[PDB]
Amino acid sequence: NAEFVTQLACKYWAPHIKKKSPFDIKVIEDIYEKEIVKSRFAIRKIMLLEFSQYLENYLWMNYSPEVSSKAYLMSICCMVNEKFRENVPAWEIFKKKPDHFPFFFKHILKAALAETDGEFSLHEQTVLLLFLDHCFNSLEVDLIRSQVQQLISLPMWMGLQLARLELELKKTPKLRKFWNLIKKNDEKMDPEAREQAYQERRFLSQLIQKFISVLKSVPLSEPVTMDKVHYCERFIELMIDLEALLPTRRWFNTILDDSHLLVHCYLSNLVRREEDGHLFSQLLDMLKFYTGFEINDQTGNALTENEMTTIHYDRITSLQRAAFAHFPELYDFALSNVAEVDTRESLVKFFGPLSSNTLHQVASYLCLLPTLPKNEDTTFDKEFLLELLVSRHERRISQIQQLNQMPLYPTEKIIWDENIVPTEYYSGEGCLALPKLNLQFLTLHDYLLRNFNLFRLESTYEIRQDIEDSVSRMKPWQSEYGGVVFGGWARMAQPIVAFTVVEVAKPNIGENWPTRVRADVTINLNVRDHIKDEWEGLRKHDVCFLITVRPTKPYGTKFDRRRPFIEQVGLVYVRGCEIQGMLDDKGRVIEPRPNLRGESRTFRVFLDPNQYQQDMTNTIQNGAEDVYETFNIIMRRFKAVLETIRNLMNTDCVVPDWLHDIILGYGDPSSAHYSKMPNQIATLDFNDTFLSIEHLKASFPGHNVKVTVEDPALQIPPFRITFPVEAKTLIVEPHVIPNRGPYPYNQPKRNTIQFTHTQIEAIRAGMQPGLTMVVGPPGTGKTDVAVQIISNIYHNFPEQRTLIVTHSNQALNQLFEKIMALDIDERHLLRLGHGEEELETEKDFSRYGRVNYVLARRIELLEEVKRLQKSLGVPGDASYTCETAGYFFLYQVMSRWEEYISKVKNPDVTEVSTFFPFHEYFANAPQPIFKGRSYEEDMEIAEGCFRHIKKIFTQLEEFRASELLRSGLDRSKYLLVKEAKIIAMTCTHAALKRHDLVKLGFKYDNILMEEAAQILEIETFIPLLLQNPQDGFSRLKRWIMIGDHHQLPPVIKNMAFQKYSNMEQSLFTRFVRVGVPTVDLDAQGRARASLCNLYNWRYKNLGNLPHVQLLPEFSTANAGLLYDFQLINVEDFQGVGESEPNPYFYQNLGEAEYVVALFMYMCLLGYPADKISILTTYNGQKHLIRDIINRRCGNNPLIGRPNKVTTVDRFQGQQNDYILLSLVRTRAVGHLRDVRRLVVAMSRARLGLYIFARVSLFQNCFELTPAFSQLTARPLHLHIIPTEPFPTTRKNGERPSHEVQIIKNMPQMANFVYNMYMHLIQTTHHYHQ
Amino acid sequence: GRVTHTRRTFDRALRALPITQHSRIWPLYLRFLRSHPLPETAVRGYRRFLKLSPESAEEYIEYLKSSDRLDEAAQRLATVVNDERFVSKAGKSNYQLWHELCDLISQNPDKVQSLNVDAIIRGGLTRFTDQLGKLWCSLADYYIRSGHFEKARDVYEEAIRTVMTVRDFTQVFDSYAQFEESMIAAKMETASELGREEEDDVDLELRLARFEQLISRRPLLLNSVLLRQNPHHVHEWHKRVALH
């Protein structure tokens, strides 16, 4: 029905048509019947409608109260569900139309409340339950919040059993007065008003009744409908959403305890059918967990051991009282203890032989149920009553210890399931048993539990997708004795002949996980020459994966690509493995390879810290078998994360008191900045940000500058800039950086970048206590302002730690490059990492490099010591080390400077030069500095050389630590603990070695982070435990993070983990959705204005720098191209647009040959071949691109190799002068829906972009309408200057004096380029080869 | 009356580095600590990170313990407790036992919150191993400043489990007697568990008498328990005694 759906869209509501047809309820109902009812809510139907924008163009903009009907409601709900699946903003039509939003919520609630299986079919009931779950979980929206306000308010508890409400008001005397206020306020109400209020209050109870009756309407064994099960599971999902949301639970949990969904759920047969209701009962276990989760109903705070124990014992005490007063048989049960009545075992030995009316009257006395009339039989069974009473007054576990005993590795019952860890073939029509990490958790343990669940699901994807990799060209076949056998040959899969343990060393101190866990996998590559060569070319930190399978499909079974490949292959265990190299004749991994004779290669790998500790803990506590031993294959192309999360979860979790609320998402999101952190620096040292006083006053556009000294010629200092706290005065006070002696080469390094007012204010909010998120859009100098803030924090802080954390190596190396010209001592920088690190920075800030430089610097300090002493005229032939050097300062330099000080400050310019005995110590320096002209300045110079000798003595003092640390890594630990003023690390390294530094010198005073968006929620929440609290408070004072919600996020292991739990929602993204302040710099200087326009309109007032506005080269003409941004149409070539020659390996050979001809045109036109970037729509597209490149160009003496022939996600952190983009996608929108990947692929060309794609198929996206307007803003052809070599002096706006080329086909463009190549081959020749 | 003379005089007396000027530099910090602990902490810290001696931190901490700044005294004590090149700084002379004495005078009946006290006991027991003496002391404190519920139960259990000598049984007997109604299942079965205490000639009656005189109602169990805790050799009228 794609034809009729697209036709209805293009006639009535599809964009890109001058005329739109009027609205029609008949048309809406007809299309609805022809798609959704006829196709059972087809994903392709709702997806063609989502490409057509059926909601934002037909449903809500033309819906109405007299027009809202079954078809419109169902279509809107299905569209919103499909948008929730496809991960695009959905509720835009609702936020546009608040007029119809309460009516829409009322109609959806009416459908969800009315009879099941009636008019609204069971599919519609699943749709309504899913819509209710989504509209509850998106509660931060205005209209949905207002809809659920009166429906989930405190008067929602007005429908629970009257005795239960009475006992609730008796336990909480504060709630009785609120209910009295509600009862008095409902007096002046209308019939419809108060009736709708009561219906809203009891809608939750009515939906719980409908779901429970839908479950109970299933027989024990006789097959049932899975759609009713989906309805009940979506009801459980809405219940779990309102159990994870704090105020959604505040009233819902009372009716939860009233109706006891747990007892009926765990008593029904749908949970007893391990096939029909399995994942439903699993979500039911998680639901009972959230229902008994220790988060107090009154406060939203967790319960203590005493609190929960008192609650349980008081339930057992009320049971004892009700037994004494109303139960003759339970006399021992009354007079029994808490330890003797609280446990289900003994409690059942007492109340299992109880009778029906006995337990029913017991529940009446405990106000659990409506009382049983005299001698009558409550229709609830003995099983129901006993289950209820046991679940109420039985023993329950501490969640802390329950999660503590957990195995961090997936077992043979978990690793191959898509129910708690869906695979890479996800569809999106259902949910999986995953947590949520979007806005707010109930407790810190709850947040950590969801984090560890997502981590275990990602590790389960890494263990599930590649476990079915045993010989996997043709689904490996069985052998005799059930053995494995490779009856075929695969390229990226090969039979690993064996796998052996080599190195499982000790863990880090205190921790529970070894640091290097290495295993060598051996494979006898009797295979093709070139394929076995690509298999033998193993590199350093190269990724491989060992596959182990438990096959049962015997020899010859063919594949069914539709079915689970996991269940087709019967896999066992997949272990990722980072092979340090293959073995040689000397058994040592390949660190030129030596002459390998034979075919068998063994590669020794260690993928993670707790690599051989996850399966270890498994075979330790959970009785599972060995995963590193049943290995069968090696295949090429998070346990330590879980153990660090467990360290935190069992750690006292004492965070900053102004960061608990931010990491909780509840509370005032604007509290954690400088404006609400109460200890901001009064007169602070922002020395680095300003270079001139006029420029400082210009970077203060909203401040009234109180300049301490009017004199214009004396004022450009590191001036003290105080913000007030009369009310807008920026106090600018002059200072002078103290002298350093005679050496002008000791000029204290000042920064030379003119960071604008927004960057200055961002650094100020970073170095004023609290935390801050500096939105650094592409090109705003994010790392520059970060290093400048670290510099200002080194100006305001002599002893504190500046813990630089980054998400990748790029940010860390850029931070080193910017600290290269900052006035920092090289004995104050330390760095952590993930193994062997290629230091891309100028001077090695690495461990051994800094320790050797430290030895050399202490040698230099000893040289200065000997020079000063010999100058003072000592006796001696022997040498003194750094300890005796500190003693030498104290003994001689103290005495000399003390004579001089108590002489001169107790006084003329002549005494300034006379009373300094440091002439022979300055005998190697510029001419005598104390000029005798001004006594104060002469003493400044002399005492500056004195304090230069003092700083030398202090270098030697800090170097006695290197004299005391015999070992290299020991000096590394010591100098990273004590003298390290700035410690730079990555997130994975920080989380893998957190306890290492924690016990080896952890101090966190201010943390500055770069690439805050590429660290995960958990991968950033982990460094929140980089230390412990300090005598009752965490030492964490400040946190300046540079981030951007509009850039590419972490690309997860499986698309299903983020499809299920939105793993793409970083902490900064949740902070943006909350409303935390975003110090959004807007001064970019890397790409032109008109070319950056493809990425500036994506941010908040994203602007440019004077460099961007005035650049003589960024306003220049492109080499053989008149348009700075072209994404031209790429028609079908030879009948091929985008094709998938391999499963989903998307490529488009038409656009690909166009792009190869384009790179050839840049080559033979002189645009430098190293300025040639091939960014694509798919890695398979880039692969086919490189194929066509080396097939048509090859090793041409006229054409070099592109700079980056890479992926949209794999080209981050970089820019380009001219990017060739191959945007294959035309039939499906793909994952371009992400604003992240959109802005990425749009902001990767600083001067020119040339793309081949489908123009209408691109503009068919609602998310990318402001993108398409400026993407197709030019003609869709190759509009260039063909005969124009690299230098053509014209600008972007000038008139050219030559002929312009307009190519419309890739054959013809390549033919032009080929005639050009023949012309140049006949008219010239190169020789470099 | 002015710090100028103090600073300049100290610097001029420090021109040489003999044992001269020492008791003029440090008592200067002593007399400066009056109404201003900042110069006292300054001289203390800079001295512990200044001219070498094992008596440096000694005089520093011994001057700081006498003032209203005592965590600085403990900081110089910690400088000694690491010391980086001499675990034993002074031979027979004591720094760790003296730190334990100061921790005792801090856990003196001022901080009776009953957490800092047991923390200081574990801190002294960590700084130096305690052969049953501070063990009995801390076990008695942990049995007295606990409650009566499973808290006191675990207190007595862990104390007896890691105990070193007797009268720990008497400590847990006091606990069990005070808590003789802590559950409505046994009424503090620790009473019977301690009536079943050590076999030959230790107490054999103490916990039983405590349980039978919690105040007094009727033991009905302590007789059998004490008479099951190791009578004479097997074959005798001991069976008839257990039968009566």
Short mmCIF file of N, CA and C in Angstrom, two decimals, chain A residues 1107-1179:
data_model
loop_
_atom_site.label_atom_id
_atom_site.label_comp_id
_atom_site.label_asym_id
_atom_site.label_seq_id
_atom_site.Cartn_x
_atom_site.Cartn_y
_atom_site.Cartn_z
N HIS A 1107 38.03 36.81 12.25
CA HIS A 1107 38.80 36.00 11.31
C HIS A 1107 37.89 35.39 10.25
N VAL A 1108 36.75 34.83 10.68
CA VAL A 1108 35.81 34.24 9.74
C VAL A 1108 35.22 35.31 8.82
N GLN A 1109 35.08 36.54 9.31
CA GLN A 1109 34.46 37.58 8.50
C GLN A 1109 35.44 38.22 7.53
N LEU A 1110 36.74 38.23 7.86
CA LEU A 1110 37.72 38.99 7.09
C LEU A 1110 38.77 38.13 6.40
N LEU A 1111 38.69 36.81 6.53
CA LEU A 1111 39.76 35.94 6.03
C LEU A 1111 39.99 36.14 4.54
N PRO A 1112 41.19 36.53 4.12
CA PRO A 1112 41.46 36.67 2.68
C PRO A 1112 41.45 35.34 1.93
N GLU A 1113 41.69 34.23 2.62
CA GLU A 1113 41.72 32.93 1.96
C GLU A 1113 40.42 32.14 2.12
N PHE A 1114 39.62 32.44 3.15
CA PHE A 1114 38.37 31.71 3.34
C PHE A 1114 37.24 32.31 2.52
N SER A 1115 37.47 33.47 1.92
CA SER A 1115 36.56 34.07 0.96
C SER A 1115 37.06 33.90 -0.47
N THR A 1116 37.86 32.87 -0.74
CA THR A 1116 38.46 32.70 -2.06
C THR A 1116 37.67 31.69 -2.88
N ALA A 1117 37.90 31.70 -4.19
CA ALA A 1117 37.20 30.79 -5.08
C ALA A 1117 37.74 29.38 -4.95
N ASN A 1118 36.84 28.41 -4.99
CA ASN A 1118 37.22 27.00 -4.92
C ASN A 1118 37.89 26.60 -6.23
N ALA A 1119 38.88 25.72 -6.14
CA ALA A 1119 39.62 25.32 -7.33
C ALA A 1119 38.73 24.53 -8.27
N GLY A 1120 38.28 25.19 -9.33
CA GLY A 1120 37.40 24.55 -10.29
C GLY A 1120 36.01 24.28 -9.77
N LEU A 1121 35.48 25.16 -8.92
CA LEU A 1121 34.12 25.03 -8.39
C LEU A 1121 33.61 26.41 -8.00
N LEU A 1122 32.45 26.79 -8.54
CA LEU A 1122 31.88 28.11 -8.27
C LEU A 1122 31.04 28.16 -6.99
N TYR A 1123 30.61 27.01 -6.48
CA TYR A 1123 29.71 26.96 -5.33
C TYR A 1123 30.41 26.32 -4.14
N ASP A 1124 30.32 26.98 -2.98
CA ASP A 1124 31.05 26.52 -1.79
C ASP A 1124 30.38 25.32 -1.14
N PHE A 1125 29.08 25.15 -1.34
CA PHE A 1125 28.35 24.01 -0.78
C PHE A 1125 27.40 23.49 -1.84
N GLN A 1126 27.75 22.37 -2.45
CA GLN A 1126 26.86 21.69 -3.38
C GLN A 1126 26.62 20.27 -2.90
N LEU A 1127 25.36 19.90 -2.76
CA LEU A 1127 24.94 18.52 -2.59
C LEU A 1127 24.02 18.24 -3.77
N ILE A 1128 24.60 17.81 -4.88
CA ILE A 1128 23.92 17.73 -6.16
C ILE A 1128 23.19 16.40 -6.25
N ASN A 1129 22.19 16.34 -7.13
CA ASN A 1129 21.46 15.11 -7.36
C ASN A 1129 22.36 14.08 -8.03
N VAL A 1130 22.22 12.82 -7.61
CA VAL A 1130 22.95 11.70 -8.19
C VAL A 1130 21.90 10.72 -8.70
N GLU A 1131 21.60 10.80 -9.99
CA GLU A 1131 20.54 9.99 -10.59
C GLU A 1131 20.92 8.51 -10.53
N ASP A 1132 19.99 7.65 -10.94
CA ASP A 1132 20.29 6.23 -11.02
C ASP A 1132 21.20 5.96 -12.21
N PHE A 1133 22.32 5.29 -11.96
CA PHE A 1133 23.32 5.02 -12.98
C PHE A 1133 23.33 3.53 -13.29
N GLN A 1134 23.14 3.19 -14.56
CA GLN A 1134 23.00 1.81 -15.02
C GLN A 1134 21.87 1.08 -14.30
N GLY A 1135 20.89 1.82 -13.80
CA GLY A 1135 19.80 1.26 -13.04
C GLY A 1135 20.08 1.09 -11.57
N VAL A 1136 21.18 1.63 -11.07
CA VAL A 1136 21.59 1.47 -9.68
C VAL A 1136 21.63 2.84 -9.01
N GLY A 1137 20.80 3.02 -7.99
CA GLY A 1137 21.01 4.11 -7.06
C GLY A 1137 21.79 3.57 -5.88
N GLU A 1138 21.20 3.58 -4.70
CA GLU A 1138 21.77 2.85 -3.58
C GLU A 1138 21.45 1.37 -3.73
N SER A 1139 22.46 0.52 -3.52
CA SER A 1139 22.28 -0.92 -3.54
C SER A 1139 22.95 -1.53 -2.31
N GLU A 1140 22.56 -2.76 -2.01
CA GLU A 1140 23.13 -3.49 -0.88
C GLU A 1140 23.68 -4.80 -1.42
N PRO A 1141 24.90 -4.78 -1.97
CA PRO A 1141 25.47 -6.02 -2.51
C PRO A 1141 25.75 -7.04 -1.42
N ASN A 1142 26.15 -6.58 -0.24
CA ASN A 1142 26.22 -7.36 0.98
C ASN A 1142 25.09 -6.91 1.89
N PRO A 1143 24.61 -7.77 2.79
CA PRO A 1143 23.47 -7.41 3.64
C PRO A 1143 23.66 -6.06 4.33
N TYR A 1144 22.83 -5.10 3.94
CA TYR A 1144 22.78 -3.74 4.48
C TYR A 1144 24.08 -2.97 4.31
N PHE A 1145 25.03 -3.48 3.53
CA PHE A 1145 26.26 -2.75 3.23
C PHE A 1145 26.00 -1.69 2.17
N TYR A 1146 25.32 -0.63 2.61
CA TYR A 1146 24.75 0.35 1.69
C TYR A 1146 25.83 1.08 0.91
N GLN A 1147 25.66 1.14 -0.40
CA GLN A 1147 26.50 1.94 -1.28
C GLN A 1147 25.66 2.39 -2.46
N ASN A 1148 26.18 3.36 -3.21
CA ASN A 1148 25.51 3.86 -4.41
C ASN A 1148 26.59 4.16 -5.45
N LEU A 1149 26.72 3.28 -6.44
CA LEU A 1149 27.87 3.36 -7.34
C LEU A 1149 27.78 4.54 -8.29
N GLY A 1150 26.58 5.06 -8.54
CA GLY A 1150 26.45 6.25 -9.36
C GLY A 1150 27.08 7.47 -8.71
N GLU A 1151 26.57 7.82 -7.53
CA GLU A 1151 27.18 8.86 -6.72
C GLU A 1151 28.64 8.55 -6.42
N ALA A 1152 29.00 7.27 -6.30
CA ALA A 1152 30.37 6.90 -5.98
C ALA A 1152 31.32 7.24 -7.13
N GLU A 1153 30.97 6.84 -8.35
CA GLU A 1153 31.76 7.22 -9.51
C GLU A 1153 31.78 8.73 -9.70
N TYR A 1154 30.66 9.41 -9.41
CA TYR A 1154 30.65 10.87 -9.43
C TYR A 1154 31.68 11.44 -8.46
N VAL A 1155 31.74 10.88 -7.25
CA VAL A 1155 32.65 11.38 -6.22
C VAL A 1155 34.10 11.07 -6.58
N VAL A 1156 34.34 9.93 -7.22
CA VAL A 1156 35.70 9.58 -7.64
C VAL A 1156 36.15 10.51 -8.76
N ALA A 1157 35.25 10.81 -9.70
CA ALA A 1157 35.54 11.81 -10.72
C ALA A 1157 35.76 13.18 -10.09
N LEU A 1158 35.05 13.48 -9.00
CA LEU A 1158 35.22 14.77 -8.33
C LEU A 1158 36.60 14.89 -7.68
N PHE A 1159 37.02 13.84 -6.97
CA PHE A 1159 38.37 13.83 -6.40
C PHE A 1159 39.42 13.88 -7.50
N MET A 1160 39.16 13.22 -8.63
CA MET A 1160 40.07 13.33 -9.77
C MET A 1160 40.09 14.74 -10.34
N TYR A 1161 38.96 15.44 -10.30
CA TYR A 1161 38.93 16.81 -10.81
C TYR A 1161 39.69 17.74 -9.88
N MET A 1162 39.58 17.53 -8.57
CA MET A 1162 40.39 18.31 -7.64
C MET A 1162 41.87 18.03 -7.84
N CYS A 1163 42.21 16.77 -8.13
CA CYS A 1163 43.61 16.42 -8.38
C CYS A 1163 44.14 17.08 -9.64
N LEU A 1164 43.49 16.87 -10.79
CA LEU A 1164 43.96 17.43 -12.05
C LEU A 1164 43.58 18.89 -12.23
N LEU A 1165 42.96 19.51 -11.22
CA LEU A 1165 42.78 20.95 -11.19
C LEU A 1165 43.66 21.62 -10.15
N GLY A 1166 44.35 20.84 -9.32
CA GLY A 1166 45.36 21.39 -8.44
C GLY A 1166 44.91 21.62 -7.02
N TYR A 1167 43.61 21.53 -6.74
CA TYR A 1167 43.17 21.46 -5.36
C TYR A 1167 43.87 20.28 -4.70
N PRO A 1168 44.67 20.51 -3.66
CA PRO A 1168 45.67 19.52 -3.25
C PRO A 1168 45.04 18.20 -2.85
N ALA A 1169 45.59 17.11 -3.39
CA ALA A 1169 45.06 15.77 -3.14
C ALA A 1169 45.03 15.42 -1.66
N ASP A 1170 45.79 16.12 -0.82
CA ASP A 1170 45.71 15.90 0.62
C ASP A 1170 44.60 16.73 1.25
N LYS A 1171 44.01 17.66 0.49
CA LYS A 1171 42.83 18.39 0.92
C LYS A 1171 41.54 17.75 0.42
N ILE A 1172 41.56 16.45 0.14
CA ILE A 1172 40.45 15.76 -0.51
C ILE A 1172 39.88 14.79 0.51
N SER A 1173 38.65 15.02 0.94
CA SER A 1173 38.01 14.19 1.95
C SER A 1173 36.77 13.54 1.34
N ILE A 1174 36.68 12.22 1.47
CA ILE A 1174 35.54 11.46 1.00
C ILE A 1174 34.74 11.03 2.23
N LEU A 1175 33.73 11.82 2.58
CA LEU A 1175 32.80 11.47 3.64
C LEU A 1175 31.51 10.97 3.00
N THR A 1176 30.96 9.90 3.58
CA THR A 1176 29.93 9.14 2.89
C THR A 1176 28.73 8.94 3.80
N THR A 1177 27.75 8.21 3.27
CA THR A 1177 26.55 7.84 4.01
C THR A 1177 26.66 6.47 4.67
N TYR A 1178 27.72 5.71 4.38
CA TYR A 1178 27.87 4.36 4.91
C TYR A 1178 29.30 3.87 4.71
N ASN A 1179 29.78 3.07 5.66
CA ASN A 1179 31.13 2.53 5.57
C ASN A 1179 31.29 1.64 4.34
#
